[PDB]
Amino acid sequence: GMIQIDALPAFNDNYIWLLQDATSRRCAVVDPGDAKPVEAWLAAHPDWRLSDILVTHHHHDHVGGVAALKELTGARVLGPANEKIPARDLALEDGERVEVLGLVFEIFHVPGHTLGHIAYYHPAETPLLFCGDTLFAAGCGRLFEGTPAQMHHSLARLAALPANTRVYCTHEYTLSNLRFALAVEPDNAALRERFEEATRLRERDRITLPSEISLELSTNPFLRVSENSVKKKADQRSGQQNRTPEEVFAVLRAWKDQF
Ligand SMILES: [Cl-]
Ligand SMILES: [Zn+2]
Ligand SMILES: [Zn+2]
């Protein structure tokens, strides 16, 4: 019943989240862009079985080790539909539900970073959210394929999730994400507090994830495009009139793209 969730470091700033049912000794992984950290953990736990592989989007740092892990473990590969996903067994659509290690996960189609990006949401007293590269700790992904209108709508869906929902994004972008946020709201007391907190964690080389939606709603600039201060600094940066929250968002993402 109890599910331990641990990050396996990979590449420069990637985290391969490893979901663990230590009673049945079955484990799952999210976005294994490098199969080697997973193979090492499985070798160190030979009586365990990797049962499920969960993919968010088709990018190399998330599927690089999926094919080799399936041929090694036979795990079921869950992936987004309408994207090429190596060795994918189940193509996931918006609104569908899956059961991984006994936990039911809702599938949210979240366009923006990529056109077919999905997210895994588990409802409980403390919900869990695996959103890949869509929502980051005090940030969001770059618009490699989607439009700002798509990405804003996607983040708006995730922001409506319960306040204590745990955000398991992929990358260790928090310190850089907070530095940009200070340029949007230098007078945000909560954001200033969070920046000093993440500065200590990264100085000790400790993880900054998972985050909570409530903390994101109060410090993440891309989730605060309706705020008066953010909308005012948005017009300041572009020198225009951002009439809609989507336009406020489009300026912020283009601003961080060159920040
Ligand atoms: Cl970014
Ligand atoms: Zn990506
Ligand atoms: Zn990525």
152 annotated as ligand-binding: no
- Please state, in angstroms and as integers, the Cα–Cα distance from residue 145 to each residue in 10, 56, 166, 172, 190, following that order: 24, 14, 26, 22, 32
For 158-178, give the DSSP string.
HHTS-TT-EEEESB--HHHHH
Which residues are catalytic, by number?
57, 59, 61-62, 113, 133, 171
Exposure string over 192-225, b if 16+ CB within 10 A, otherwise e: bebbeebeeeeeeeeebbbbbbebbebbbbbbbb
Ligand 2 centre to CA of 51 (Å) is 24
The token pair that represents 250 in the structure block: 């489009």
What's the 210 CA to ligand 1 centre distance in angstroms? Answer: 18
**How far separated are the first and last CA of the chain, in Å rounded?**
44
Whether the Cβ atoms of residue 246 and residue 152 lie closer than 8 Å to each other? yes
Report which bound ligand comes closest to the CA of 114. Answer: 2
**Structural domain containing residue 8:** 1-259
Give the ligand at the shortest distance from the Cα of 14.
3
Paired residues of 14 in beta bridges: 10, 171
Question: Does the annotation place 109 within a ligand binding site?
Answer: no
122 is annotated as contributing to ligand binding: no
Q: Is 113 annotated as a binding residue?
A: yes
Measure CA 16 to chain center. 11
Phi and psi for 211 in degrees, rounded to 5?
-95, 175
Q: Domains in the chain: how many in total?
A: 1
Residue 24 Cα to ligand 2 midpoint, Å, equals 32
Q: Measured in angstroms, how far is the CA atom of residue 133 from the centroid of ligand 3? A: 6
DSSP secondary structure string for all residues of the chain? --EEEEEEEETTTEEEEEEEETTTTEEEEE--S-HHHHHHHHHHSTT-EEEEEE--S--HHHHTTHHHHHHHH--EEEEETTS--TT-SEEE-TT-EEEETTEEEEEEE--SSSTT-EEEEE-SSS-EEEEETSEETTEE---SSS-HHHHHHHHHHHHTS-TT-EEEESB--HHHHHHHHHHH-TT-HHHHHHHHHHHHHHHTT----SEEHHHHHHH-GGG-TTSHHHHHHHHHHHSS---SHHHHHHHHHHHHHT-
235 is in an annotated binding site: no
Q: Which ligand is nearest to the CA of 171?
A: 3
Q: Which residues surround ligand 2, an ion (CB under 5 A)?
A: 59, 133
Report d(CA 80, CA 57) in Å as an integer: 7
CA of 218 from ligand 3 middle (Å) equals 24
Gyration radius of the chain's alpha carbons: 18
Ligand 1 centre to CA of 192 (Å) is: 19
Amino acid (1-letter code) at residue 155: L
| Ligand 3 center–CA 45 separation, angstroms | 27
